[PDB]
Design a protein around this ligand. Sequence first.
Ligand SMILES: *[C@@H]1O[C@H](CO)[C@@H](O[C@@H]2O[C@H](CO)[C@@H](O)[C@H](O)[C@H]2NC(C)=O)[C@H](O)[C@H]1NC(C)=O
Ligand SMILES: *[C@@H]1O[C@H](CO)[C@@H](O[C@@H]2O[C@H](CO)[C@@H](O)[C@H](O)[C@H]2NC(C)=O)[C@H](O)[C@H]1NC(C)=O
Ligand SMILES: *[C@@H]1O[C@H](CO)[C@@H](O[C@@H]2O[C@H](CO)[C@@H](O)[C@H](O)[C@H]2NC(C)=O)[C@H](O)[C@H]1NC(C)=O
Ligand SMILES: *[C@@H]1O[C@H](CO)[C@@H](O[C@@H]2O[C@H](CO)[C@@H](O)[C@H](O)[C@H]2NC(C)=O)[C@H](O)[C@H]1NC(C)=O
Ligand SMILES: *[C@@H]1O[C@H](CO)[C@@H](O[C@@H]2O[C@H](CO)[C@@H](O)[C@H](O)[C@H]2NC(C)=O)[C@H](O)[C@H]1NC(C)=O
Ligand SMILES: *[C@@H]1O[C@H](CO)[C@@H](O)[C@H](O)[C@H]1NC(C)=O
Ligand SMILES: *[C@@H]1O[C@H](CO)[C@@H](O)[C@H](O)[C@H]1NC(C)=O
Ligand SMILES: *[C@@H]1O[C@H](CO)[C@@H](O)[C@H](O)[C@H]1NC(C)=O
Ligand SMILES: *[C@@H]1O[C@H](CO)[C@@H](O)[C@H](O)[C@H]1NC(C)=O
Ligand SMILES: *[C@@H]1O[C@H](CO)[C@@H](O)[C@H](O)[C@H]1NC(C)=O
Ligand SMILES: *[C@@H]1O[C@H](CO)[C@@H](O)[C@H](O)[C@H]1NC(C)=O
Lengths: 217, 414, 375, 49, 49, 49, 49
Amino acid sequence: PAYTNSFTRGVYYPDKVFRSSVLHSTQDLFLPFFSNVTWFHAIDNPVLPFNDGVYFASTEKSNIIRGWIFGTTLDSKTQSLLIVNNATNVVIKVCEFQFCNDPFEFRVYSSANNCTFEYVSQPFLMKNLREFVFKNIDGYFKIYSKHTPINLVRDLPQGFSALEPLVDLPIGINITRFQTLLAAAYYVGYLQPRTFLLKYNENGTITDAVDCALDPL
Amino acid sequence: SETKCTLKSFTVEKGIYQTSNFRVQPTESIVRFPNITNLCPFGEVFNATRFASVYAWNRKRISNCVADYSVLYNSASFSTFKCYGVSPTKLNDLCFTNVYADSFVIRGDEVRQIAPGQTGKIADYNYKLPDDFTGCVIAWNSNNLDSNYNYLYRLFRKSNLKPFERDISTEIYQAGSTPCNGVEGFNCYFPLQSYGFQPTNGVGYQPYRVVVLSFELLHAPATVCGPKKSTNLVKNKCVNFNFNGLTGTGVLTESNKKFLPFQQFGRDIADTTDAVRDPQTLEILDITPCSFGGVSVITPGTNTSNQVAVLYQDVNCTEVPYSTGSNVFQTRAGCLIGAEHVNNSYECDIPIGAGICASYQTQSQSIIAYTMSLGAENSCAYSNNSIAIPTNFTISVTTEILPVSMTKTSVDCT
Amino acid sequence: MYICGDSTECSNLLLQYGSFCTQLNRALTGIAVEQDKNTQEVFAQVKQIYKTPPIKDFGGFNFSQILPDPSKPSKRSPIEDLLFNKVTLDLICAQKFNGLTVLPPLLTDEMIAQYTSALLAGTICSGWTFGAGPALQIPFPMQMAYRFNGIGVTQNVLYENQKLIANQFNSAIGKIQDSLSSTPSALGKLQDVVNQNAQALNTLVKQLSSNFGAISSVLNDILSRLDPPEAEVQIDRLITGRLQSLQTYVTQQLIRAAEIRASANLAATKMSECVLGQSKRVDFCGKGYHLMSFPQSAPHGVVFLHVTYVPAQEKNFTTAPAICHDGKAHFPREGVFVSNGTHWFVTQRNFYEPQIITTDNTFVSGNCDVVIGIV
Amino acid sequence: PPEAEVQIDRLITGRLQSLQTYVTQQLIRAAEIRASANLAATKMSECVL
Amino acid sequence: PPEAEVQIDRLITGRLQSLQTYVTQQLIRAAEIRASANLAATKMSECVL
Amino acid sequence: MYICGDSTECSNLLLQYGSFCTQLNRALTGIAVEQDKNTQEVFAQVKQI
Amino acid sequence: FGAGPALQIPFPMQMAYRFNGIGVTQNVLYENQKLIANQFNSAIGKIQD
Ligand SMILES: *[C@@H]1O[C@H](CO)[C@@H](O[C@@H]2O[C@H](CO)[C@@H](O)[C@H](O)[C@H]2NC(C)=O)[C@H](O)[C@H]1NC(C)=O
Ligand SMILES: *[C@@H]1O[C@H](CO)[C@@H](O[C@@H]2O[C@H](CO)[C@@H](O)[C@H](O)[C@H]2NC(C)=O)[C@H](O)[C@H]1NC(C)=O
Ligand SMILES: *[C@@H]1O[C@H](CO)[C@@H](O[C@@H]2O[C@H](CO)[C@@H](O)[C@H](O)[C@H]2NC(C)=O)[C@H](O)[C@H]1NC(C)=O
Ligand SMILES: *[C@@H]1O[C@H](CO)[C@@H](O[C@@H]2O[C@H](CO)[C@@H](O)[C@H](O)[C@H]2NC(C)=O)[C@H](O)[C@H]1NC(C)=O
Ligand SMILES: *[C@@H]1O[C@H](CO)[C@@H](O[C@@H]2O[C@H](CO)[C@@H](O)[C@H](O)[C@H]2NC(C)=O)[C@H](O)[C@H]1NC(C)=O
Ligand SMILES: *[C@@H]1O[C@H](CO)[C@@H](O)[C@H](O)[C@H]1NC(C)=O
Ligand SMILES: *[C@@H]1O[C@H](CO)[C@@H](O)[C@H](O)[C@H]1NC(C)=O
Ligand SMILES: *[C@@H]1O[C@H](CO)[C@@H](O)[C@H](O)[C@H]1NC(C)=O
Ligand SMILES: *[C@@H]1O[C@H](CO)[C@@H](O)[C@H](O)[C@H]1NC(C)=O
Ligand SMILES: *[C@@H]1O[C@H](CO)[C@@H](O)[C@H](O)[C@H]1NC(C)=O
Ligand SMILES: *[C@@H]1O[C@H](CO)[C@@H](O)[C@H](O)[C@H]1NC(C)=O
């Protein structure tokens, strides 16, 4: 539905190493430049097939987007990752939950069971460009976040976004399907293993990059 | 004498010879390690009442704490304590992260754990361990202590075991073409076969309590690691720093960069360790290596005199540790020790560096260093309506030597 | 140090491989010595320093764009300043930390400029006479008249056209300076050498962070992780990799140094022939008939300003092999017979200076019945 | 025989590397000497004759 | 795989050595041919023209 | 293609040895460019046909 | 044409110029033009054989 182009947003820091005025090439999963991201609308929220990574821009101001569902089967057996994010607390749990149906309060199995991982973080999570990236690598969930001051561009804000990593909580699940925990819209951008060239600035921030898969130039 | 040994001869001709390399040596040693001192949960998966089954083991996530592997290693117990990628004696000094203790029980005969890539099918359907395994394997005898947690094992799963993957529910299995709609015996047999050896006395087959530790080495925040000590932090000194397990030698100095809050290790062009983060008090320190260069011996011929003048190639003036002749003098090609600077200029005798030359001057018989003279001044009086015509000649015969053919050598192979 | 810095175990393991390190050090030292020798043959031709004359009475020739300028602290001519500015190269600090060092050249750029100005203040004053024996002073217009006779053109062409030739000289030198300043690809040969050297040095350093089949690229990580029986194997693998990389770098440096030595020999020959003389070899010193050259210092190189005489403004004539006056064939002594349609003259071959055909401009040989095309 | 083969292979690799290095050095030196000899022949033909 | 890595590593080392030797010999031969081409260009310039 | 011809398992080990392939490719490319320059220098003296 | 612009000249006159260059006068070529041309043609024909 009204497929918007990805442009050149979705670049993060592959590892926690400070490099300055250098051109390093990494073989890491990045969102390909000038791709297509579905313009899913949520004023509703079907099961988005999480394959290998999700680009979650979802500009909004009403904070209707509370959290994110991330489950393998979403019924039983496997553990379900839930990242409910209130005004301040961003409490996360991996307890086995059926998740019931679309939320608006715990719309889950309400049975707990395998309530093992219960990290809460707490400080904060949030001109309100969410700019989230999710991926599972060798039993490690990594979330990359950044806020962009955009209040005039309806489509994707042409430019660059050096996504500083947010947290590196070690968990593990296949997460075949996922759905946003809900007047705005949320895009999804699938992740592929594309070699990238990254130009770290003199201050250590990735000012620009080129996708080494797009065109022969 | 060093120059004499370098040329493998007792006679040294006039010139400058490169002998040995200079290197500033460390004075102190820094073993800065994180603040954590509370002991790790060892014995929770070691001194436990029961362990898990091979089909469904337990993956305990050891977290931030001091892990004293020496207590486990030197204990007069266990067996087949084989550590892959690490040495048990050096297990304490290394500062790891993400050590995942796996506890479970197998049969007495195997005790293999798929160690390098072992093809044994006992654990080929139960528990596969990756080839690049930087951890340790420990096996314990359980005959005396309730030979009941042997439980069961996966007889077959018609599928290979992906490394470090756990399969729990295996009910449907078949070998014939008939679909397994709740039929086990006719098609073949149902999986998850049991093992009964809770008492008995069968030697060589008593259940073994096998626990493996899988450290994750290399660059990491290094949450859980060993019981080392902590030395103070000295700046602008050649030290043997050991930051969070990163061993090396260099001069740690207060930084100026803008290290991002999530970044730990600093690099630069060509990927060398330009910066580091201090584990106790988070601060960035640039690590430039201690200075070094090439020691050169400016010497006249030993037939003339037995005096020399050392030239350290790159050390400025103060990194200096013959060796000292009360004539230290800074050039553009490093510190020159043993020669006196003479303001007068002569033709170059022994080239040194960027314009500096050295020679043996009698008027005391000491080595002097000067700036080379290009040639004799011949200010020529140019003037119009004035030409100079020679009135005599001089037939001069010069010489010129040119090598033509080198020696013809043929070298056999076998 | 490059194979393994501050590591006694790897250093002891390196001694088993013979004297490879000694061979590499000897080759690199020989290359450095040869590089020191290269600039002592191009520039150090004459060991006598001639100061640039203070007064400027060279007959209209400017020369201010090639002689040293006593205004800036560096005694370099404006063209030399442009050449030095155009060729431009911390990267060196990071490389230096891996056992690499850059020995400074024996002759600084100031002494190279002094040597160049010595060759330039001798060519102006004496000409080619200071390259053979003692310097013999001669006025510059007469030196250029000597050089005009070197290409078959008589002395009258210069003296009667002294102002025009001086103006063309000054304009050509100004155009040369403007072309050097404007086009950024002029100094390509000197920049390619620096680029190749820097690229090779960068490739040498980047080979240190390679596993080469070992557990880790860092030797310290391997050393304080395993017992000596296995650390020996890992360090041996690393040693083999680093040794192969160093050998490849050294061989490439040797080949490049041989090429640079050939170029330096050609440059020294060009200096000796074009600068300290007037070469009759075609297309050696510039395109056209060579007159004289001026050397200029450049970063890791030399720039020659080849002054040449190029004819233009052709005129079409009718020529005869000889002229039969009366039963005798008169051939031109020096020159060629040329008629503009009705009257016959004898002119020079490189210029149009018609003259009456007398018995002084011609010499007799035989009768006028053997030459084909006689008139 | 197995460990002897392994060590003999190591020695073979070392000696082969040494021979290759000697051959390459000889080739470069021979190129230098050939350039010098070409210069000498040109000098002879253009100055003696 | 874990046992085939050794064999393919031996093959990689051998082929790398062969390619390096070929490249070095080609570089030396190219230098010689460049010298011959420079001589030919000089001969053309100073004799044909 | 020469060392590990159409094999991902071998091509993955070829990355362990650094950038040797890049150096060989660059050397051969430089040799070819030098051959082209030699051919241009010898014959293309006067640009008037 | 290799030292500026091309100036036409009859080939016998150019041969006379070259004879002057080698030292011999103009008379030797112009009075022996047929013999020199025949020798030149014979030499070129013998080169092919
Ligand atoms: C619990 O594990 C610890 C590991 O150290 C064992 O404690 C050791 O016991 C031996 C005798 O068996 C003593 O010599 C050591 O000094 C003890 N070490 C420590 C640190 O206390 C203990 O045996 C285990 N308990 C069992 C096997 O029942
Ligand atoms: C030689 O040429 C230079 C450069 O054109 C002349 O220097 C110029 O002199 C005029 C007159 O004084 C000044 O207005 C210009 O600014 C100068 N140009 C530069 C670039 O400095 C010089 O005068 C000429 N020499 C003689 C003897 O006339
Ligand atoms: C030869 O060419 C020169 C220029 O190369 C001619 O000199 C020019 O003459 C014109 C007309 O008088 C002047 O406007 C120019 O300024 C002169 N140029 C220079 C550089 O001085 C010269 O006239 C030509 N001679 C003949 C005989 O044709
Ligand atoms: C070109 O030829 C013409 C004749 O065609 C020559 O011009 C004559 O020269 C004579 C002798 O001085 C004069 O008396 C006549 O008045 C000239 N005639 C004309 C029409 O000008 C001329 O000398 C030749 N010039 C050159 C440069 O070869
Ligand atoms: C130059 O003049 C002589 C006579 O002075 C010409 O010779 C004559 O040529 C004609 C035609 O071939 C003969 O018929 C006469 O017998 C010749 N006379 C003598 C005295 O030998 C000669 O041809 C003239 N040259 C040219 C080029 O016209
Ligand atoms: C992959 O996801 C599927 C789909 O639910 C699940 O059955 C399976 O257990 C997952 N595998 C792993 C290794 O997580
Ligand atoms: C880098 O940080 C410095 C801190 O002094 C700042 O002045 C500069 O503007 C920054 N550069 C960029 C490109 O943001
Ligand atoms: C570690 O302890 C020191 C000494 O009290 C203290 O200054 C420092 O803040 C501590 N670090 C952390 C991360 O708590
Ligand atoms: C080198 O030492 C001199 C004094 O001998 C001093 O002035 C200079 O600053 C020093 N330079 C460096 C880079 O340490
Ligand atoms: C004669 O030479 C002139 C030089 O300007 C040229 O233009 C003309 O074409 C030539 N004539 C012939 C017939 O070749
Ligand atoms: C030039 O060629 C013509 C035409 O063939 C011929 O008649 C004549 O003899 C030749 N020589 C001269 C000097 O005209």
